[PDB]
Design a binder for these strands. Structure first.
Ligand SMILES: [Zn+2]
Ligand SMILES: [Zn+2]
Ligand SMILES: [Zn+2]
Ligand SMILES: [Zn+2]
Length: 111
DNA sequence: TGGGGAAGGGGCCC
DNA sequence: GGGGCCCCTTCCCC
């Protein structure tokens, strides 16, 4: 547990404090060597490296389809069985993604 | 109404 | 012991 001096906000993880402080500044030190695109976080750069490399480490356990990104894999999982897994309690409406539920819970104003 | 992309925080392990 | 590498979330916009 560490507290950010700039924002007085608790951040979990001893080594994660430099990452949060970088979010206040807008610096993007990590730069891809191929497309010369800068990213704020290293793990974001590695995902961009997957796009350049074309590797798909996420393989479906039901049909064997290979996808490059985790959310792409989860989208394929919803095609198999998980289509529309979110519901609105107030109005009884189904949704595909969790952000759409947040959009509905704010824009629709059922409550 | 749906999806791609990006921006953040957290857990595990070294 | 700062950090890679994975996970998760909501937001912006077409
Ligand atoms: Zn801060
Ligand atoms: Zn690149
Ligand atoms: Zn599949
Ligand atoms: Zn509703």
């Amino acid at each position: 547990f560490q507290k950010c001096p700039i924002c007085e906000k608790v951040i979990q993880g001893a080594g994660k404090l430099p990452r949060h402080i970088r979010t206040h500044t807008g610096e993007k030190p990590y730069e891809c060597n191929i497309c010369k695109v800068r990213f704020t976080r290293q793990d974001k750069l590695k995902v961009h490296m997957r796009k350049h490399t074309g590797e798909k480490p996420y393989l479906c356990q039901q049909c064997g389809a290979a996808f490059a990104h985790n959310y792409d894999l989860k989208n394929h999982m919803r095609v198999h069985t998980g289509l529309r897994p979110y519901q609105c309690d107030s109005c009884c409406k189904t949704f595909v993604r969790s952000d759409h539920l947040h959009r509905h819970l704010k824009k629709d104003g059922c409550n």
